Design an enzyme around this catalytic site. Structure first.
Site, PDB file in Angstrom:
ATOM      1  N   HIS A 176       0.886  -1.078   0.228  1.00  0.00           N
ATOM      2  CA  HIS A 176      -0.050  -0.042  -0.045  1.00  0.00           C
ATOM      3  C   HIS A 176       0.894   1.232   0.136  1.00  0.00           C
ATOM      4  O   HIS A 176       1.290   1.768   1.147  1.00  0.00           O
ATOM      5  CB  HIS A 176      -1.044   0.040   1.223  1.00  0.00           C
ATOM      6  CG  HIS A 176      -1.863   0.917   1.226  1.00  0.00           C
ATOM      7  ND1 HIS A 176      -1.819   2.078   0.489  1.00  0.00           N
ATOM      8  CD2 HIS A 176      -3.055   1.131   1.946  1.00  0.00           C
ATOM      9  CE1 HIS A 176      -2.964   2.934   0.752  1.00  0.00           C
ATOM     10  NE2 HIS A 176      -3.777   2.330   1.451  1.00  0.00           N
ATOM     11  N   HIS A 179      -2.690   7.068  -0.904  1.00  0.00           N
ATOM     12  CA  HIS A 179      -3.659   7.788  -0.225  1.00  0.00           C
ATOM     13  C   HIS A 179      -3.202   8.338   1.142  1.00  0.00           C
ATOM     14  O   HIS A 179      -3.558   8.888   2.200  1.00  0.00           O
ATOM     15  CB  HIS A 179      -4.437   6.839   0.475  1.00  0.00           C
ATOM     16  CG  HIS A 179      -5.449   6.070  -0.685  1.00  0.00           C
ATOM     17  ND1 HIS A 179      -5.438   4.759  -0.485  1.00  0.00           N
ATOM     18  CD2 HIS A 179      -6.144   6.233  -1.793  1.00  0.00           C
ATOM     19  CE1 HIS A 179      -6.236   4.367  -1.711  1.00  0.00           C
ATOM     20  NE2 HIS A 179      -6.667   5.456  -2.266  1.00  0.00           N
ATOM     21  N   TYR A 181      -0.475   7.598   2.966  1.00  0.00           N
ATOM     22  CA  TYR A 181      -0.268   6.932   4.404  1.00  0.00           C
ATOM     23  C   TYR A 181       1.548   6.703   4.255  1.00  0.00           C
ATOM     24  O   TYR A 181       2.125   7.652   3.515  1.00  0.00           O
ATOM     25  CB  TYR A 181      -1.024   5.464   4.202  1.00  0.00           C
ATOM     26  CG  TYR A 181      -2.152   5.507   4.508  1.00  0.00           C
ATOM     27  CD1 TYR A 181      -2.650   6.300   5.700  1.00  0.00           C
ATOM     28  CD2 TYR A 181      -3.281   5.372   3.714  1.00  0.00           C
ATOM     29  CE1 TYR A 181      -4.030   6.461   5.889  1.00  0.00           C
ATOM     30  CE2 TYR A 181      -4.690   5.652   3.658  1.00  0.00           C
ATOM     31  CZ  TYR A 181      -4.912   6.008   5.041  1.00  0.00           C
ATOM     32  OH  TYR A 181      -6.252   6.065   5.221  1.00  0.00           O
TER      33      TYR A 181
END
Ligand code: WI6
Ligand code: FMN
EC number: 1.3.1.42
Length: 364
Positions: A176, A179, A181
């Protein structure tokens, strides 16, 4: 319908191109995968279809949402194995998304109430608020900017989590990097204000994601590693002064990892703002696809018609859907039949009930 033509995602023979996008749902009480997750993923699994799990913690400090699963303990591995087995019993392929939120956390989510970690010491601005365990919205705190030894420790937490995912039976993992993060806090020049070798230039800002991907590749094999980024999503203050250039710099690093390791990643997964502009967003997506030597998953606001068009035109190999899969467990079948789609209830996106708003959306 080209969404129903088969596709070889390296070692995996997929029967269709509709992918379940990773979605945090907050049913994994105490960070332990629960039986409810098994029911949820089994409902959505199809023979030859590819699923990506909700973001999954790589360490005790990696969370910024309540009741999200981890894969850093052996208890979590044992419980994930039960879920992976029911999905494989339907003939689906499933990857675990490995997620660290960086500064997008709060003391309530951190061990001993310690400060969250990041590339930077600046807090997310108060334009944004964090969902708290009690359902209220709170203030993101000042994070601690980590040194380069601690960066290498986080890379090791990704590596160990990837090995744990393989132990649970997952077919692979997704990094991931989207976004706003932790990885995106290094990528984006609107967040990364470091003056060491992980800040400044495009090469320096891409070092962290390159090191994370290279570590997991070395541990489990490139063909079991996917990577998700979002160059033009500005969530949690994650803006870049030149989003396409940043995206192309990430893609160049993935191409080099592949050349140096002699194998291709499972895929690159690029997500874009998902609420309706059109021509410009499609050009950014196609430009990143054209730059990447391998399989490409597009994501964000796709419809049935836009997914068909993306595959038919060669703009993407696979199409991931998030919100429609919340409320249409048989979304693959509904897309195949062109059947009407059912609405979702945002109020139960992140609640804890094992059934309500989670596994009680009906099939056709
Ligand atoms: N769970 C996660 O990690 C979230 C990460 C990013 C995207 N999230 C969900 O994906 C879907 C597609 O996102 P999209 O690209 O459409 O954008 P949004 O994140 O919905 O941003 C739209 C606007 O909503 C406000 N907004 C969104 N999140 C927050 C927040 N946390 N605090 C304050 N405002 C917020 C801002 O005005 C945004 O521009 C939405 O349902 C969204 O809630 C999920
Ligand atoms: C409830 C919810 C949770 C999400 N959680 C994650 C997540 O864990 N990891 C991730 O990479 N994206 C996450 N997303 C973003 C989705 O994967 C998807 O990219 C986004 O919803 C846009 O696609 P869509 O228009 O098909 O929904 C989440 C989105 C929603 C609505």
């Amino acid at each position: 319908n080209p969404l129903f033509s088969p596709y070889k995602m390296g070692k995996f023979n997929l029967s269709h191109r509709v992918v379940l996008a990773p979605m945090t749902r907050c049913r994994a009480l105490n960070n332990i995968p629960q039986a409810a997750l098994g029911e949820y993923y089994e409902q959505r699994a199809t023979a030859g279809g590819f699923l990506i799990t909700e973001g999954t913690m790589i360490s005790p400090t990696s969370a910024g949402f309540p009741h999200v699963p981890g894969i850093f303990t052996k208890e979590q591995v044992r419980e994930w194995k039960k879920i992976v087995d029911v999905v494989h019993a339907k003939g689906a392929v499933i990857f675990c998304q490995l997620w660290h939120v960086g500064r997008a956390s709060h003391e309530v989510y951190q061990p001993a109430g310690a400060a969250p970690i990041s590339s930077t010491e600046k807090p997310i601005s108060n334009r944004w608020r964090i969902l708290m365990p009690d359902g209220t919205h709170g203030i993101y705190p000042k994070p601690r900017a980590i040194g380069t030894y601690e960066i290498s420790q986080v890379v090791e937490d990704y590596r160990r989590s990837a090995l744990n995912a393989i132990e649970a039976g997952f077919d692979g993992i997704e990094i991931h990097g989207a976004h706003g993060y932790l990885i995106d806090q290094f990528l984006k020049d609107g967040i990364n204000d470091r003056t060491d070798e992980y800040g400044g230039s495009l090469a320096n800002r891409c070092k962290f994601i390159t090191q994370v991907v290279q570590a997991v590749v070395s541990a489990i094999g490139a063909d079991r590693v996917g990577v998700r980024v979002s160059p033009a999503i500005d969530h949690l203050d994650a803006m870049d002064s030149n989003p396409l250039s940043l995206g192309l710099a990430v893609v160049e690093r993935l191409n080099k990892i592949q050349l140096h390791s002699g194998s291709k990643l499972a895929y690159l997964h690029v997500t874009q703002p998902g609420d309706g502009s059109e021509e410009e967003e499609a050009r950014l997506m196609r430009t990143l696809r054209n730059a990447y030597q391998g399989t490409f998953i597009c994501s964000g606001g796709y419809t049935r018609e836009l997914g068909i068009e993306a595959v038919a035109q060669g703009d993407a190999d696979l199409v991931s859907y998030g919100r429609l899969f919340i409320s249409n467990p048989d979304l693959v079948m509904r897309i195949k039949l062109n059947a009407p789609l059912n609405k979702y209830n945002r109020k139960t996106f992140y609640t804890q009930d094992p059934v309500v708003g989670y596994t009680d959306y009906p099939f056709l």
